[PDB]
Amino acid sequence: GSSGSSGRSPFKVKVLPTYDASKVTASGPGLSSYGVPASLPVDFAIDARDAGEGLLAVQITDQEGKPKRAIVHDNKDGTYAVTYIPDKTGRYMIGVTYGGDDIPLSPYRIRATQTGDAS
């Protein structure tokens, strides 16, 4: 089941938005394919060329799918930084979104390289 359909407007055209998720990309250690240090404060960079401006949001989950703490850094220089401390190593799935629209790049598959953690 579902419901809603809320929100109206007295005047609004059907033109194209200035922003564009598709034009959104990210680079850095936080998304390093080679691997990332477990229990280490890592952050990536979001450089937008033709993505314009759009509500950015990050969702970090674990192999089980638990909510992870994600900090938001504002540079106001045409980019966006995000720090995340992966405590519980494992398959991490990051779901980046811009202006209520997920990019064709996400989700993101990363592996937290941990050592020891004997139980």
UniProtKB/Swiss-Prot annotation:
Filamin repeat locations: 16-112
Expressed in which tissues: Ubiquitous. Isoform 1 and isoform 2 are expressed in placenta, bone marrow, brain, umbilical vein endothelial cells (HUVEC), retina and skeletal muscle. Isoform 1 is predominantly expressed in prostate, uterus, liver, thyroid, stomach, lymph node, small intestine, spleen, skeletal muscle, kidney, placenta, pancreas, heart, lung, platelets, endothelial cells, megakaryocytic and erythroleukemic cell lines. Isoform 2 is predominantly expressed in spinal cord, platelet and Daudi cells.
Modified residues annotated as Phosphoserine in this record: S9, S106
Modification after translation: ISGylation prevents ability to interact with the upstream activators of the JNK cascade and inhibits IFNA-induced JNK signaling.
Phenotype when changing A38G: In a breast cancer sample; somatic mutation
Function per UniProt: Connects cell membrane constituents to the actin cytoskeleton. May promote orthogonal branching of actin filaments and links actin filaments to membrane glycoproteins. Anchors various transmembrane proteins to the actin cytoskeleton. Interaction with FLNA may allow neuroblast migration from the ventricular zone into the cortical plate. Various interactions and localizations of isoforms affect myotube morphology and myogenesis. Isoform 6 accelerates muscle differentiation in vitro.
Written domain comment of the UniProt record: Comprised of a NH2-terminal actin-binding domain, 24 internally homologous repeats and two hinge regions. Repeat 24 and the second hinge domain are important for dimer formation. The first hinge region prevents binding to ITGA and ITGB subunits.
Assembly and oligomerization: Homodimer. Interacts with MICALL2. Interacts with RFLNA and RFLNB. Isoform 1 interacts with FBLP1, FLNA, FLNC, GP1BA, INPPL1, ITGB1A, PSEN1 and PSEN2. Isoform 3 interacts with ITGB1A, ITGB1D, ITGB3 and ITGB6. Interacts with MYOT and MYOZ1. Interacts with HBV capsid protein. Interacts with ASB2 isoform 1; the interaction targets FLNB for proteasomal degradation.
Disease: Interaction with FLNA may compensate for dysfunctional FLNA homodimer in the periventricular nodular heterotopia (PVNH) disorder.
Entry's family note: Belongs to the filamin family.
Protein name, UniProt field: Filamin-B
Lineage: Eukaryota, Metazoa, Chordata, Craniata, Vertebrata
Gene symbol of the encoding locus: FLNB
Entire-sequence positions represented here: 1504 to 1615 of 2602
